[model samples]
Target: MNRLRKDQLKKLPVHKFKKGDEYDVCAICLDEYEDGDKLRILPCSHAYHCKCVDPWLTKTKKTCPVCKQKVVP
Candidate 1:
C-alpha cells in the first residue's frame, strides 16, 4: 500500500529530537524541533516530527514531505 499503516510505521525507527541534529525544522509543522520531541527518520534520510508527518504518511500520502521521495514502493 502507498499509505503506511500503523504497523508499518512501527517498523520505521522513531527517536527523540535534540539540538545540533541533522534537521532543524519539521517539514509538516515547520516548527523547530525542541529537545525530547518525537521524530521518525525515513528511508530517504529525511526526518519529520511524528505528530507532523504521521498523518501525512498514514492519511495524506506516503512520501517524504520535503523530497517527495517514496516512503514505500
Candidate 2:
C-alpha cells in the first residue's frame, strides 16, 4: 500500500490561508475556508483542508480528488 507517510505529506505544501483568494473551500468536505485555516495545496494547484486532504493522501490514492493529479512526484 502506497500510503503516504507523515514526512512525505509534510513535504507537500501546508500553510494557513492568508491573502490568497484564488481558493475559498475544500472540495473534499465542501467546507468554505476561512482566514488562518490550514490548507494543503496539491501539485495540480487544487486546494483542500489539511485534515480533509491528508487522509485522502495517506489512506487512499495520492491524487487530487477533482483533477486526478498525483500529490507527489
Candidate 3:
C-alpha cells in the first residue's frame, strides 16, 4: 500500500465543531469515529476519523479524505 503523505492532506476541509454536536465511536471495532461524527483536524490540515480514515489511507490510497488528493507514496 502507498504511504499517505502529509503535504497533500492539507486540502481536506475540516468539520468545525458547533454547539450541541454529538459524536460516537464505532462499537464493534472500538474506534472513536462513527456515522455523523465530526472531524478532527490533522497536522496535514486534513480532517478524518481518529480511526477509520487512517486505516483506509494506509491500506488503500493516500488521497485526502475530503478533497481526494494524493498525499503520500
Candidate 4:
C-alpha cells in the first residue's frame, strides 16, 4: 500500500469538533474529539484523529477503518 505524504495529508480536509456536533470519533480509537482538535479527512470523507489514524496508515493498513476505503490515492 502507498503511504501518504505530508503535503497530501495536509491537503485533505480537516474537521474540528464543536459543541453539539454529532460526528463520530476516530475509528481507530473510539475516543471523542474535543473542541479545536484537528482531524484528518480521508478521501472517503471519514474523519479521524492524526494520533489514532496515522499509525494505522503508516504501520498497518492504508484504508479507512470504518469503510475500508483506500485512503491513499
Candidate 5:
C-alpha cells in the first residue's frame, strides 16, 4: 500500500498580490476567488479568496491573512 503526503492533500496556489487590497470570491461554492467576483473585507484589511478562506476563519482562525493579525470581531 501507499500513502499521500500532507502537502499533496490539497493545492494552495500562491496568490501574488501586494498588501492592502480586497479580493473577490465565488458565492456559489464559496471557495473559488477571482477578480470581479465581489469581496468581503476584514479589519486587518487583508482580503482573501472569500470562498476559500472564509470557512477557515469562521471555523478556526480569527486571524488575518498569513500574518495572523487580529481581525474585527
Candidate 6:
C-alpha cells in the first residue's frame, strides 16, 4: 500500500465539526467527532477523525475509507 508522506499528510485540510454541523461521524470508527476535534481530509475530500484515519493510513490502508481514493502518489 502506498503511504502518504508526513508533509503531504499535514498539508491536507483539517475539518472540525461545528454546532449543527451535518458531519458528525467518522466512517472508520463510526464515532462522532466532537467540536474542536481535528479531522483529516482526504484527497477525495472525505474527512475522518485524525485518530481514526492516521493509524489506518499508517497500518491498515493508504486509501480513503469512504471512497477508496489513493491517499498518496
The best candidate by lDDT is 1
Candidate 4, 1-73: lDDT as tens digits: 4565566566667777787776656566788788887787788878888777776676777778779888766
Each model's lDDT: 0.84, 0.84, 0.53, 0.73, 0.47, 0.78
Per-model TM-score versus the true fold: 0.86, 0.86, 0.38, 0.71, 0.44, 0.78
Model 1: how far residue 60 lies from native, Å:
1.2
lDDT per residue, candidate 3, 22-55, as tens digits?
A: 5444332455554455464554565556355655
RMSD of 3: 6.9
The deviation in Å at residue 37 for candidate 5 is 0.7
lDDT of 6 by residue, 28-72 (tens): 788887878888878787888888888778777778877788877
Instruction: For residue 27, give model 1's deviation from the true position in Å.
Output: 1.5
For each candidate, C-alpha RMSD in Å?
A: 1.5, 1.5, 6.9, 2.1, 12.5, 1.8
Candidate 6: list runs displaced more than 4 Å: none
Residue-wise C-alpha lDDT for candidate 2, range 1-73, written one tens digit per residue: 6678888899988878876677876787888888888999888888889999899889988878889877788
10 residues in a row with least lDDT, candidate 5:
1-10
Which sections of candidate 4 miss by over 4 Å?
A: none
Q: How many clashes (backbone N, Cα, C below 3 Å) per candidate?
A: 0, 0, 3, 0, 2, 0
Candidate 5 segments whose C-alpha is farther than 4 A from its true place: 1-35
Q: Show where candidate 1 strays beyond 4 Å.
A: none
Across 1-73, the per-residue lDDT of candidate 5 in tens digits comes to 1222334213223344433434444333556454444444555555555455556555666565556765542
**What's model 2's lDDT at 38?**
90
Assess candidate 1 and give its lDDT: 0.84
* Candidate 6 TM-score, true structure as reference: 0.78
Worst 10 residues of 3 by lDDT: 19-28
Question: Deviation in angstroms for 22 in model 1?
Answer: 2.3
